[PDB]
Design a protein around this ligand. Structure first.
Ligand SMILES: OC[C@H]1O[C@H](O[C@H]2[C@H](O)[C@@H](O)[C@@H](O[C@H]3[C@H](O)[C@@H](O)[C@@H](O[C@H]4[C@H](O)[C@@H](O)[C@@H](O[C@H]5[C@H](O)[C@@H](O)[C@@H](O)O[C@@H]5CO)O[C@@H]4CO)O[C@@H]3CO)O[C@@H]2CO)[C@H](O)[C@@H](O)[C@@H]1O
Ligand SMILES: OC[C@H]1O[C@H](O[C@H]2[C@H](O)[C@@H](O)[C@@H](O[C@H]3[C@H](O)[C@@H](O)[C@@H](O[C@H]4[C@H](O)[C@@H](O)[C@@H](O[C@H]5[C@H](O)[C@@H](O)[C@@H](O)O[C@@H]5CO)O[C@@H]4CO)O[C@@H]3CO)O[C@@H]2CO)[C@H](O)[C@@H](O)[C@@H]1O
Ligand code: PLP
Ligand code: PLP
Lengths: 809, 809
């Protein structure tokens, strides 16, 4: 149908249909008369999967031959989403399969909706891991993603009475056609036990053993015939034992390690099961890495053949684990082992929020990982000796830099451990990386300035443009070709069409079609009722106080009160859409969701408002839902308090898909505004410096309450029970928090936010100019491609050169 | 190579090799340079599996068209063993695949050894279910086997220090290529809750729900293109919730239902988890049966379209469950529902041993299945009213026949429930069925004589002759053709070759080759050391006191003592092989195993004995091991105390494979001797009548101890520590039991057993005559084919006619 989806050859379509029927018959064991859409989805899935295997086997064979430096990306999260369409896109089979399925009397995009999301992540951090695997494969890097195969990913969110309800996400129920179990490569992982010191060295004994079974999933590069591997570990008990029965039933205890993903976004919870997950993935991955290395005995060349990237501190145990293996098993001397470890490891920091920092109680590590605690203490001692030698007499510095935090309960600061054992430490956006050097890690930056770098996040243009917005990818290709898909910088050529009347018409037309399609889905599923002509105001991301969905709520209420104030006055109609999940134990986040639905209950049924304002809460926000709502958005809400959102990635997705952005100078927003020009961005609120000055004199919410009539009115409505008639004090926690314990200064940005919002309503009533500004955003979003991000990691951290060279098909 | 394995067509072998390479590449995602024997086994497995699907789909389609009466075989056990070779045999692909694999440079029988046994059974009862499915498919019956998909079957047995060690049997570890998960047909099963009585009737509410997911495995008939289904249920928790995490982790509680097979052979253990398994399989199976029935509303025709066979009392809850559905859900009146239930259900009894009888505590049923207990009480009342009307004033009869046993703890006698709700009740061998009418169920037989029948057990000649003893199947085919394979009675034609010098030579040659092959395996695996010229004395079956492995032990010790008595005297050399598993909590059974290995420790290292006597304990006895040792046996030990072994099936396997039998007049042994002629059998010991007379005056083991010098000597050696130097009193329990609490009268049969054993040694030293007797056994073993057994069930119980009609390929 459209150019960017490849061609549908006669020979190709015919071969596809043949294999489709083969799988339906032999693989699914079904006939056309009993098959359901699900069966058809699977037949197609296995059909596409077949085209991957040849390339997968050749790619791995290629790496074995050339033996290039290997890149290992360790993460406890890989927010993959659906795999069917992304595979067709990267293999250029989309139109062929679409045709083939058409000829068999089936609607392909109906089948695509049947696929379950691989929701093995919480949000930003996990999606970044997913975009990275895609870019690394597209750039010909010999990379491997290593993680855990959770049988239950992020919970499915349901709203009952306006409240969030969590439901188990049983994504493996009907099977996963993309994975290949590899029981033959099962590895043992040890826990507990004790340490014995002999004349030969230290020995970790009397440990409990848990087996790690790997499952490999193919990661296809963009039309270069490269297929990398994502290896996920699953926990299994040894066959070798209350009673015979109970012993068999207690095997579940060991296998619970890979049972479910901890649903916390940017929040640390020191539970033992979580620590086990962290060590489990690290211990299994390193044995696999060393094994593959020995099949290419001095490890002096180890860092020339291996690079280990730590996605946050979650897999930080890789550092002492690597030392344990090199020292205890291979028997290299400490200093040699340490040198190799630092040259091999790199750490990526994702937030400066204190409650997200991993600090493990020493008594936990002591019981669960005896030898690792000893190694950590040893690392700390040698590290502190260096600090003392560089800053003689600075005793407070020693205490601040220690990997060990003193107090009622001793803890290990995993971030300090990562900095000490890595040759590189990077933030995820320029402003975030600076903040790391100026505040949180100032002492470390002073000792080893060379370790600190910046690597601004990015998103993959394949899934976030071609796959989810074919219409836009097409009209762009028409003007500048398809080369941009693997080189986003080329989108700048679109700057010459900003005054092109035809282009302006097409951009606006694609947006309109996307809105109509989403408006339909919103009514087809969830029986709702939006107006496709209104401005689509959307804020989708995990529910958090620092992300300030509450500030958005205050705007919505302000808009509503102004309409009731002057009903016959004209106002640009809007459809305000807020979506995202709240961690199960985050009370305030759960209240915010209930408040959003409560506002919707009042606003959406007030006859005076009509279809001028609607407040929709998007249920179960996930990768597949993001692919639908983002292309249909007009306005992207990125309003975190300056200094709190390390980078953000959702912001980039919206820029690439034609939405204008209203946000604070935080995270990557700064660089985005910088790339597109501040005039083409809706910036407002305090800058980082303003927040600091305010914390200086002390933030008093009362002040804003007394000086802003409209703000006062909103709080009073909340307190009196205007949005909760049957439970007048339902939102007392929210009001109390905003008035007395607001760590994120919501009130401080209210005035400028409302004014700025008026500025967007004004630009929207002039279609031509709004679209032209949109074109300036899309045209300058090239820098936010994860291909650019990965190319910088490769050259500045891993020491490998990216390659666009097509691999033999 | 051999005729009975089908032909290897040029076109066939070429197509097989092609698909083999296809699966290795696309299915296993491997290349010839990294593939292991396991990968090759799987490529071949998927290749053979492909040939089943076409027939499988057509067979099920055929049944949907003709809509014949359906047969449902409910069993908590299906001891299937390996599936690869059995599938090739029934599809006539053995030689083709053997050739195809040969040309690819692979040894096919090496690959067959890689397949894990599907050990979902304990012994006789479970294997019978397996032989039955095979026969029902071979006879064109629209039959379905229904059970539970245990993820852990019967434990793997290891011997440490002569003691049995149990190890989890993780048979699904590398995957099961034969099964097809059918998540789309998942059904809910209810537990707990309470009963509410409305004006509309009774309602079971506030129950806990557990989902039943089916897995279908194909059951191919013998070269008739019929492929039936065995549907096994797996327990799964509903997605709809201590904490979010704990709720997800507690899903394991519900899924534990199908986690492991209870390892008890002929022994009842009243655990709650077992009751759940029993109801789980019954509740899911009946909804499936009714659903399929409604897709052909009065159930008056239900018994014309459905037959439900209960394999023992394990699935006895099907009776009140069927009533519950018909009365509570469909709303038929009690009397109508009951009529339908009785006409639909049939019960097969497997033992008269009191400790094996299922008697569930009322307090258990009351908590777990509230409504079923009420229905059972109601059934009991109406039943007792009929007893009272037929035997007025016989108050003791009422108490003996009640489904409810009174006492400190009320219990429900499931066998009484089965008899009451079934139109047919059968024993598994003539003598066993008579015993049921004379003793255990005498009262029931008096009330409804028409319900009691006999259906002597049988074994499938496919797996137990063609598959495990190709050499013997071949020399037989040479003389009378291949028709016998699906009509064992034809083996009688072999009676005319009893004097044929050539045949006699071939029979003896096949036996010799089988012994050489087993002798090798015994040394290749387990590093042992037997003499292929000695007589192979074997007793393999579950370890039990009633099976009397102990009597065998006494013979072995007698033989040893006689050799040390007169070292230079000649004696027919023997290799005594005893094998079998003991239930984990059966102390005495564990001691018997230790005693066997202990005797081996003394006998196998006594230089004076030389290679004239060897005592081997066959480790981990299972279906695949039976396929190897049975064809190599010379003497089959079937020495249970008269009246205790309901039938036995191992005895038949040995008859069909060329071994002579030494046994008591018990179970099917009686009919076997009857078929072959008592002169061609080695019968000894007390008859049922003799055991009774002895219980009358009272069994005093002391008497035999005082009158038999050799017996006395053996007990003294045991007591003094002759077979346990480091632990002189190690076997005090055994001696004490034999002397004071022997329920099975071991001593009572010792003298006749030893004498009879001398008779076999005498016949063995005359090769020609021993072989001729062997030919008379093989020639008359036709009656013990499970095809004959199934044909009788079909005509005398289910009301359906068997068919040998080839189904279109
Ligand atoms: O094998 C070499 C080494 O072994 C032995 O030393 C080990 C210790 O026995 C063991 O406890 C561990 O030491 C840890 C210590 O337990 C831990 O608390 C931490 O101590 C740091 C503080 O974290 C740091 O703040 C600073 O403490 C200041 C404190 O802030 C300030 O308020 C005031 O109280 O002064 C304190 C000390 O000046 O420094 C301490 C000390 O570094 O970290 C320690 C090292 O990781 O590990 C040791 C080595 O493995 C033997 O005892 C030793 O002789 C051998 O050299
Ligand atoms: O709805 C119809 C019916 O409902 C109610 O009756 C029900 C009972 O309330 C309920 O308990 C249950 O009755 C069971 C009884 O609980 C159970 O113990 C059993 O009783 C049998 C004995 O098993 C049997 O041995 C025999 O008992 C003898 C005993 O051996 C002897 O030693 C001496 O003690 O005399 C005894 C009685 O003569 O008989 C009893 C009685 O049958 O079985 C009972 C029936 O299953 O279920 C009842 C019906 O569901 C109402 O109370 C009743 O009026 C209604 O007709
Ligand atoms: C990209 C994405 C995120 C991250 O969004 P931010 O606004 O940067 O927090 C979270 N969830 C999903 C499903 C995403 O696609
Ligand atoms: C046939 C068989 C049995 C039953 O043997 P009996 O001697 O009748 O108890 C038990 N186990 C296996 C593995 C069998 O093949």
């Amino acid at each position: 149908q459209i150019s960017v989806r490849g061609l549908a050859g006669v020979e190709n379509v015919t071969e596809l249909k043949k294999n489709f029927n083969r799988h339906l018959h032999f693989t699914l064991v079904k006939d056309r008369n009993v098959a359901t859409p699900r069966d058809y989805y699977f037949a197609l899935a296995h059909t596409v999967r077949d085209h991957l295997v040849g390339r997968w086997i050749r790619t791995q064979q290629h790496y074995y031959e050339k033996d290039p430096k290997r890149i290992y990306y360790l993460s406890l999260e890989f927010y993959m989403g659906r795999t069917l369409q992304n595979t067709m896109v990267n293999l250029a089979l989309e139109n062929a399969c679409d045709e083939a399925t058409y000829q068999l009397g089936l609607d392909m995009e109906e089948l695509e909706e049947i696929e379950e999301d691989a929701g093995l992540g919480n949000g930003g951090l996990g999606r970044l891991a997913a975009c990275f695997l895609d870019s690394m494969a597209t750039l010909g890097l010999a990379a491997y993603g290593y993680g855990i195969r959770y049988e239950f990913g992020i919970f499915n969110q349901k709203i009952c009475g306006g409240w969030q309800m969590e439901e188990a996400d049983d994504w493996l129920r009907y099977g996963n056609p993309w994975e290949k179990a590899r029981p033959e490569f099962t590895l043992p992982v040890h826990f507990y036990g004790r340490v014995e010191h002999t004349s030969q060295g230290a020995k970790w004994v009397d440990t409990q053993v848990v087996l790690a079974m790997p499952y490999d999933t193919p990661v296809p590069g963009y039309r270069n015939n490269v297929v990398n591997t994502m290896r996920l570990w699953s926990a299994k008990a040894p066959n070798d034992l209350g009673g015979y029965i109970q012993a068999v039933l207690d095997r579940n205890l060991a296998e619970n390690i890979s049972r479910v993903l901890y649903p916390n976004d940017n929040f640390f919870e020191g539970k033992e099961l979580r620590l086990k997950q962290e060590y489990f993935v690290v211990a299994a991955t390193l044995q696999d890495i060393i094994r593959r290395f020995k099949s290419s005995t001095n490890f002096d060349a180890f860092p020339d053949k291996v690079a280990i990237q730590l996605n946050d501190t979650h897999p930080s145990l890789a550092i002492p684990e690597l030392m344990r293996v090199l020292v205890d098993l291979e028997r290299l001397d400490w200093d040699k082992a340490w040198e190799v470890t630092v040259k091999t490891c790199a750490y990526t920091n994702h937030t400066v929020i204190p409650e997200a920092l991993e600090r493990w109680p020493v008594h936990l590590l002591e019981t669960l990982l005896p030898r690792h605690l000893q190694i950590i203490y040893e690392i700390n001692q040698r590290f502190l000796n260096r600090v003392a030698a560089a800053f003689p007499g600075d005793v407070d510095r020693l205490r601040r830099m220690s990997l060990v935090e003193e107090g009622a309960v001793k803890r290990i600061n995993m971030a300090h451990l990562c900095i000490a054992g890595s040759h590189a430490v990077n933030g995820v956006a320029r402003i975030h990386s600076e903040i790391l050097k100026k505040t949180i890690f100032k002492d470390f930056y002073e000792l080893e300035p060379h370790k600190f770098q910046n690597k601004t996040n990015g998103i993959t243009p394949r899934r976030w443009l071609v796959l989810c917005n074919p219409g836009l990818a097409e009209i762009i290709a028409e003007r500048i070709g398809e080369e941009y898909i693997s080189d986003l910088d080329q989108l700048r050529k679109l700057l010459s069409y900003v005054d092109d009347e035809a282009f302006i018409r097409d951009v606006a037309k694609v947006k309109q079609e996307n809105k109509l399609k989403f408006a339909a889905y919103l009514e087809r599923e969830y029986k709702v009722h939006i107006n496709p002509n209104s401005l689509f105001d959307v804020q989708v991301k995990r529910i958090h106080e620092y992300k300030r969905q509450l500030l958005n709520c205050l705007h919505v209420i302000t808009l509503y009160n102004r309409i009731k104030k002057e009903p016959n006055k004209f106002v640009v109609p809007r459809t305000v859409m807020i979506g995202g999940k709240a961690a199960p134990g985050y009370h305030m986040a759960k209240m915010i969701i209930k408040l959003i639905t409560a506002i919707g209950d009042v606003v959406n049924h007030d006859p005076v408002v009509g279809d001028r304002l609607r407040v929709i809460f998007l249920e179960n926000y996930r990768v597949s839902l993001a692919e639908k709502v983002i292309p249909a958005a007009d306005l992207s809400e990125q309003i975190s308090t300056a200094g709190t959102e390390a980078s953000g990635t959702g912001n980039m997705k919206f820029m690439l898909n034609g939405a204008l952005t209203i946000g604070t100078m935080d995270g990557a927003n700064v660089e985005m505004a910088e790339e597109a020009g501040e005039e083409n961005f809706f910036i407002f609120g305090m800058r980082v410096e303003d927040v600091d000055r305010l914390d200086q004199r002390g933030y008093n919410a009362q002040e804003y309450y007394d000086r802003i009539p409209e703000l006062r009115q909103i709080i009073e409505q909340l307190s009196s029970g205007f949005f909760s008639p049957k439970q007048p004090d339902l939102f007392k926690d929210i009001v109390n928090m905003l008035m007395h314990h607001d760590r994120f200064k919501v009130f401080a940005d209210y005035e400028e936010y409302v004014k700025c919002q008026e500025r967007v309503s004004a630009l929207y009533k002039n279609p031509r100019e709004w679209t032209r500004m949109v074109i300036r955003n899309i045209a300058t979003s090239g820098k936010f491609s994860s291909d650019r991000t990965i190319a910088q990691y490769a050259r500045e951290i891993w020491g490998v050169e990216p390659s666009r060279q097509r691999l033999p098909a």
